[PDB]
């Protein structure tokens, strides 16, 4: 309850959150870097021209 | 009673220290995040030198 050194629930939460946060943030951040390209924003305008 | 009074003062100090320590550990975690960010910035500067 007080959280001795290897209290299985608390220790597991720590180890999972290390993976969980790093992976998810990497994917969002690298996804925004891959999506940063100006020509891709031009592809949204192109999709507008194409549908019209 | 005299022994209890002397012991009580020591106990109060210990309790105060523990409370301070709890505040301190949280601050240390925050410091690590700040430290990590500056290191990343330094690495970027190194890349410019390579160019």
């Amino acid at each position: 309850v007080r959280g001795m050194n290897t209290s299985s629930a608390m220790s597991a939460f720590e180890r999972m959150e290390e993976k969980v946060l790093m992976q998810e943030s990497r994917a969002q951040a690298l996804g925004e870097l891959a999506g940063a390209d100006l020509e891709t924003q031009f592809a949204q305008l192109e999709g507008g021209s194409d549908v019209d | 009673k005299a022994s209890l009074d002397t012991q009580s003062t020591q106990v109060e100090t210990l309790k105060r220290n523990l409370i301070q320590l709890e505040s301190k550990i949280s601050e240390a975690k925050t410091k690590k995040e700040m430290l990590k960010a500056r290191i990343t910035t330094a690495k970027a500067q190194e890349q410019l030198q390579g160019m």
Binding site: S25, A29, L30, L33 | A37, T40, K43, A44, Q47
Partner: peptide, 27 residues
Amino acid sequence: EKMLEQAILEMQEDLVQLRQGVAQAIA
């Protein structure tokens, strides 16, 4: 050509590392 060719390969890998660092900062 040899001095120039080696440099081009090296700069690209460095850029990828820099991007990862930026992502970490963003994270």
